[PDB]
Amino acid sequence: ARVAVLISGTGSNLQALIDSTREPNSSAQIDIVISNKAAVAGLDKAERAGIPTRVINHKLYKNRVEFDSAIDLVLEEFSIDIVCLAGFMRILSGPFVQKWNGKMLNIHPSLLPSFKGSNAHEQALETGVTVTGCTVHFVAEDVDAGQIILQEAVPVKRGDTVATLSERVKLAEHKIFPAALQLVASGTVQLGENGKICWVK
Ligand SMILES: Nc1nc(=O)c2cc(CCCCc3ccc(C(=O)N[C@@H](CCC(=O)O)C(=O)O)s3)[nH]c2[nH]1
Numbered sequence: 001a002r003v004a005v006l007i008s009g010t011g012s013n014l015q016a017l018i019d020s021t022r023e024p025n026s027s028a029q030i031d032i033v034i035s036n037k038a039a040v041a042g043l044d045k046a047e048r049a050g051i052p053t054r055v056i057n058h059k060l061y062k063n064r065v066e067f068d069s070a071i072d073l074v075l076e077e078f079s080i081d082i083v084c085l086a087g088f089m090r091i092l093s094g095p096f097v098q099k100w101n102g103k104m105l106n107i108h109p110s111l112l113p114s115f116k117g118s119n120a121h122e123q124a125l126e127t128g129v130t131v132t133g134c135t136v137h138f139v140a141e142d143v144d145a146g147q148i149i150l151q152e153a154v155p156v157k158r159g160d161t162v163a164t165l166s167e168r169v170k171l172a173e174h175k176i177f178p179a180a181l182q183l184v185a186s187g188t189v190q191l192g193e194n195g196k197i198c199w200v201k
């Protein structure tokens, strides 16, 4: 399965995916990395790994649909099968989501359905949970509401900040995102007719 990874910053999840997809038994290969932000460290990581990169800024497009179409063009160019959102901090439009239904994965740093949105760690700390975690899910039109593939719980320590908590949760992210990509790319897991997750094996 040919994979595109979309990023907006540091790219630690990208690096974990690059590492995993180069294992001999990997069913996925990363053929393109796309960023909406220029000069971010995730681009350096891709380049260093010998993977092509494309930057697409919102300032060159009228609306969200034309922005996504520019993404889609590149996806089609590289004959992509699966899209991974790895620190990609943009909402995707309906038709784009619909086109890639069952083919697009996102990593989110909470145990969904808790703490949806762009500041999950802030929410978890504000709420005072002692257990948080991360979630890989299929992307549906409603944000962070798509079908869940894998999750991993991560403890919150007293005195945790966004800095220390996100560091701990990222170690879990780097485990389940490669595991989830491998499940989907090997055809072991799929979105299924009724919409709910289907373990084909
Ligand atoms: N259709 C859809 N379903 C999803 O399940 C899903 C997950 C993501 C992944 C992202 C979800 C977290 C985010 C929530 C809100 C954000 C936001 O408003 N981003 C700005 C970017 C501005 C900037 O920082 O430069 C924007 O969209 O314009 S980012 N994107 C998705 N889109």
Ligand SMILES: NCC(=O)N[C@@H]1O[C@H](COP(=O)([O-])[O-])[C@@H](O)[C@H]1O
Pocket: 008, 009, 010, 011, 012, 013, 014, 042, 086, 087, 088, 089, 107, 108, 109, 117, 118, 119, 120, 134, 166, 170, 173
């Ligand atoms: N809602 C999306 C979201 O909050 N994504 C989060 O952004 C970080 C990106 O780190 P990275 O650039 O080092 O992979 C990750 O922690 C990811 O879970």
